[PDB]
Amino acid sequence: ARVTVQDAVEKIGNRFDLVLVAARRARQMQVGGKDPLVPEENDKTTVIALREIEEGLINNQILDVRERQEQQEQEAAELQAVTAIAEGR
Amino acid sequence: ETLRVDPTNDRLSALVEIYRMMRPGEPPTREAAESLFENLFFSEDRYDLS
């Protein structure tokens, strides 16, 4: 369990945005699109996300970057799919 | 001075102002004012201290 979030509050200053970011990440884990970045102790996604914040390997910057990259990861897949839609003309 | 503030003169007048006090806005009547005032504190029916 995570008794105090002070360390996470150290990694990202705002402390509300801590809740938001850790939330978003915890969601990334809870509805599984992804896996933890650090060993799961049986800790629920709620705490795993916080452990990820405390280790400084997860925050708003990192998440935004990863997501932005994944958009192009899908664009690459559907590259030949959507260009086949030239029937639009 | 109480008399100096009294708008009325005779008994009928007083009963008029009283009946118009208790049941205001409706036209007063002699039998009405009399019946009211007699039925307030003087009627064995509508009143008692026991």
């Binding site: - | 205001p24 806005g25 409706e26 036209p27």
Partner: protein, 53 residues
């Protein structure tokens, strides 16, 4: 004069009109007869009213 609560503004407004005499009733009824029979006669004087019937 106006105490609101239309029970009054009615009760007083009607109280103005004086009660009818036993003769006045007959007067009014006679006036009724005059009016009506007038319109009936006016109807009888119209050709289309007949032809329609």
């Amino acid at each position: 004069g106006r105490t609101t609560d239309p029970v009054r503004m009615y009760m007083r407004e009607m109280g103005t009109v004086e009660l009818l005499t036993r003769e006045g009733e007959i007067d009014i009824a006679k006036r009724i007869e005059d009016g009506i029979n007038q319109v009936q006669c006016s109807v009888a004087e119209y050709p289309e009213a007949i032809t329609y019937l």
